[model samples]
Target: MTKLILIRHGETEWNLLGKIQGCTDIELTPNGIQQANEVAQQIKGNFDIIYSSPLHRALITAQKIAGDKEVHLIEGMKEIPFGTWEGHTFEELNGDINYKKFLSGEDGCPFDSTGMSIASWSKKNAQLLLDLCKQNENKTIVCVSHGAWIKTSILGLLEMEPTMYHKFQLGNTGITTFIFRHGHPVLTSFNSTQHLL
Candidate 1:
């Protein structure tokens, strides 16, 4: 069995501005840096390995949590590409027809969407994580990634449509655990933010 510990990166300046981060690189706010330190304290498990998204926001937080340990980057863990909505908030895109459809989770993403296809991104990389976890069976692993990608990945693990549980919330630095037994995964805990309390 393997223990999969998923951790979302700390908040960023864009997050405070209510902007969509997408793949756009943004630095973390002061509070975010402090939160990462808290994560370092709360995480007592000695992860056999640590992995993080290539984004700096995630990489920085992973560094804080892992201390002297190494944190490998995985391309599959990057956040979903938000296209034109990269720097805008929902309130800003309120009148856009495509944005409305995107929020409704209808018509399979959007015709005007740019960058990668959201509908298939999670599924395409779903096996990448499964295989990674299987490769480290009986070991504890920590994966630091973004909110949207992590939520979509959890859905993929449950064999459900990527958009089915899209509304699930992942606060900054929250920890979630998935136990893999006999290659089957089960969510043991999710969105634990007590460390920041």
Candidate 2:
């Protein structure tokens, strides 16, 4: 069995502005740094390896959690690219036909415009999770990633439909736990924010 712990990166300016970060390299807010520190101090148990997205927000959060450990960057773990909608707020995109379709998970939503479909993005992350578990049996691993990526990856691993993506919320620095046995992933916990309390 392998234990995987997923953490969403600390809060960002985009998060405050309610904008889509979408692969944009944004810095963490002061409170975000504090949140990372708090989570780092509160997370229980020792992790064998740390993996993070190359994006600064995730990398920095992973570093905080890792302390003396080295963090390995994985490009596949990055957030979904929003393309033209990258830095826009929902209010700004309210009338955009494509954006509306995308929100509704319609077939013609043109996720490819951003260089990846939701299905493809979820599949990549799911496979990466499986590969990581296979490579590190009986070990605990930490992965720092974005909100969408974390949610979609979990859903993908569970063979759940992508349309359920927005069914739950993942707060900044929130912790999620999963255990893999014989290559099958079982979610032990969803988003937990006790560390932030």
Candidate 3:
């Protein structure tokens, strides 16, 4: 079995403003830096390797927790593209009919980002992460990613529908763990932020 430690990137100005940060590449706020350090202190055990989204927000957090270890940037771990809703608040997106449809649980997704669809994009990225996990067995690995990506990946891995994306909230620097046995993932913990306390 391989242990996978999943973490969300620290908070950013976009987060504070309630804006859609899909692939916005926002930097972490000062509080976010502190949060990362807190989580790093809580990681008592060692991790064989660290993987983080190429975005600075996630890379910085991964760097803090990785300590002496090298952090590998991962392109497949980026946040969902918010399309036209990128950097916009809910109130700003509320006027769009598709955004409204997404909010009402219709056949669309939140925000209108270009180039990718949420469902398939998330599935692909999630599968990539899973495949990477399957490649490393009987080891502890750490992955730092965005909130939406983490949520989407977890649900996708469990064969859950994407619509359940909001079922669980993943706070900044939140830590989750999974045990991969025989190529299947078993979630041991989710959305743990006690380190911030």
Candidate 4:
């Protein structure tokens, strides 16, 4: 059975500054690089495919982790298009009187006046991952991506209600593993970052 190892990219300056980094093209901080090194070293298996999101932070981390391994880029791993809110502070949105409509999540991603979503952006990509697992059930693959997108993939994998699990933060440089056996997927590990915590 193919084992899927998922890791959130290391922290960035925007992360420390509390900026909404939905699509910001910022580099990882020094500590972020150090944290990623720790994660790479802690990984337990030989990864056959190293998949990563297109975002800068995720890409940087993915490259570091893959280091000489086969790495692939996937647009489906990007964070939810926060649209106009990508580089702004959360307080800015909160101060806007019209911002309340966005929190409903029913707006189907309000900041995304651009009309993208957790599902629209990356949900479709989950199948590629599932298919990979299905094809090579005995191998191990790793995916490096953003928090929100990773969480979305988790929902896609387990077929669980996003409502009950969206709040599950994957954390910076966190590790999660999903086991696939005989066509069924099981979340053997979730959000385990104690190694870096």
Candidates' lDDT values, in order? 0.80, 0.84, 0.81, 0.74
Candidate 3 structure, TM-score to reference: 0.91
TM-scores of all predicted structures: 0.90, 0.92, 0.91, 0.84
Give the clashing pairs for model 2: none
Cα lDDT over the full model 3: 0.81
Best by TM-score: 2
Candidate 4, residues 1-197: lDDT per residue as tens digits?
67899899999998888778887778899999988887877774368878888887888888888878867887767776676777778787875533564454454334446565544433555676687676666788888988777777787777654353446767799888988655667889988887684
Model 2 Cα shift for residue 81 (angstroms): 0.9
Candidate 2 vs candidate 3, TM-score winner: 2
Which regions of candidate 4 are displaced past 4 Å? Answer: 95-102, 105-111, 119-122
Candidate 1, residue 156: CA error in Å? 0.7
lDDT of 1 at 171: 91
- When summed lDDT is taken over every stretch of 10 residues in candidate 1, the lowest stretch is 109-118
Task: Kindly report which residue stretches of model 1 are placed more than 4 angstroms away from their true locations once superposed.
Answer: 110-112, 115-118
C-alpha RMSD of each candidate structure in angstroms = 2.0, 1.8, 1.8, 2.6
Ranking by TM-score: 2, 3, 1, 4
- Candidates ranked by lDDT: 2, 3, 1, 4
lDDT of 2 by residue, 12-113 (tens): 999999988987899999999999999898864388999999999999999999998899998888887888888888788877877666677775234536
For model 3 the local lDDT of residue 133 reads: 78
Task: Tell me which of candidates 2 and 4 scores higher on TM-score.
Answer: 2
**TM-score: which is higher, 1 or 2?**
2
Residues 16-52, model 3: lDDT tens digits: 9998897778899999999999998898547898999
Q: Over 4 Å off in model 3, which ranges? A: 108-115
